[PDB]
C-alpha cells in the first residue's frame, strides 16, 4: 500500500507567493541548510496556465556558491510547496521551480560606474468473402 501510495489574479498569486516564500526561507523551517544560505528573492512569476511557479533568487558572485545554493534550493522546493498548502496560504500551488536572477550583481555595477562617470560641466477486404470464394 505505502509503496504504491508513495491579470489581477496572477498579480495576487505572484505577490503573495513571494510574500510567503520569503518567510519560509528566513527560518530553519524548511531546513537548516536552507536557512544558512541566506537566500534573497527577487520576484515570483506564476505562469498563465499555472503549470509552474518561478522563484527568482538573487544570484551571487561566486559560481560555486551559486551552484551549491541552486542544488539545495531545488531539492527543498517540493517540500516548500507542502508548507504553503499546509499553512493554508493558497489552496493550490504549482510545482515550484527556482530560477536565477543575476540582475542584482548588475544593479550594484551600474552605481559604481555611474558615480565614476564624467558627466561634464553643467468491409469486403476485412470479411472472408474474398477468401471463401477462392
Amino acid at each position: 500500500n505505502l509503496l504504491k501510495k508513495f491579470s489581477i489574479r496572477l498579480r495576487v498569486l505572484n505577490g503573495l507567493l513571494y510574500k510567503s516564500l520569503t518567510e519560509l526561507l528566513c527560518t530553519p523551517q524548511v531546513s537548516q541548510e536552507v536557512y544558512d544560505l541566506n537566500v534573497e528573492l527577487s520576484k515570483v512569476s506564476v505562469t498563465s496556465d499555472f503549470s509552474a511557479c518561478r522563484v527568482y533568487w538573487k544570484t551571487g558572485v561566486s559560481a560555486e556558491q551559486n551552484k551549491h545554493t541552486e542544488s539545495v534550493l531545488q531539492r527543498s522546493a517540493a517540500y516548500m510547496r507542502h508548507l504553503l498548502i499546509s499553512q493554508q496560504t493558497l489552496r493550490n500551488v504549482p510545482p515550484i521551480v527556482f530560477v536565477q536572477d543575476k540582475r542584482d550583481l548588475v544593479l550594484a555595477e551600474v552605481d559604481r560606474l555611474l558615480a565614476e562617470a564624467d558627466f561634464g560641466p553643467p468491409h469486403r477486404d476485412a470479411s472472408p468473402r474474398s477468401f471463401l470464394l477462392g
Binding site: 495576487v12 498569486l13 503573495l16 520569503t22 518567510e23 528566513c26 493554508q88 496560504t89 493558497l90 489552496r91
Partner: protein
C-alpha cells in the same frame, strides 16, 4: 569555565555586569514585528518609556512599511533617541514573526546600542481564540 546561553537567574548572585549594571537593570528593547508594520520601543527596567520608533514613523508607507530595510531604519532611529537619553546596553524582547524581526535587531546594533540577550515573546495560545478563516486564493 564556559559561556552560558541561559540567562542569569533573577534573585541570585552572578559575576556578569554590563557597564556596572546587573541583568535585571539593563533596559529592554521591545520589538513587535508584524507582517505589515515593525514597531520598536525601548524602556528602562522600571518600565519607563525612553525611545519609540516604527516603520511608519520613519516615513515608509503602505507596502514599503513592511519590508526588511524599513525595520532596519526604524531600529537605527530608536537607537538614536535612546542613545541620547543615556542607553548603551539593551535586552531585546522580539515579539512577532514578521519581516523586520531580525532587521529591527540589526538596526539597533548599527545605531550604537549593545544587545546582551535576545528573548522571544511571540504569543502562542495553549488551545485560546479561534483564528480567522483561511483565505481562498
Amino acid at each position: 569555565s564556559r559561556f552560558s546561553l541561559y540567562p542569569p537567574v533573577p534573585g541570585q548572585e552572578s559575576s556578569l555586569q554590563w557597564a556596572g549594571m546587573k541583568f535585571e537593570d539593563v533596559p529592554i528593547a521591545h520589538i513587535k514585528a508584524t507582517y505589515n508594520n515593525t514597531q520598536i520601543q525601548v524602556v528602562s527596567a522600571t518600565n519607563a518609556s525612553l525611545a519609540r520608533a516604527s516603520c511608519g514613523t520613519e516615513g515608509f508607507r503602505n507596502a514599503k512599511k513592511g519590508t526588511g530595510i524599513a525595520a532596519q531604519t526604524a531600529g537605527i532611529a530608536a537607537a538614536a533617541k535612546a542613545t541620547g537619553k543615556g542607553v548603551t546596553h539593551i535586552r531585546v524582547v522580539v515579539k512577532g514573526m514578521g519581516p523586520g524581526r531580525w532587521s529591527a535587531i540589526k538596526g539597533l546594533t548599527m545605531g550604537g546600542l549593545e544587545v546582551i540577550s535576545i528573548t522571544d515573546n511571540t504569543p502562542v495560545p495553549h488551545x485560546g481564540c479561534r483564528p480567522r478563516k483561511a483565505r481562498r486564493l
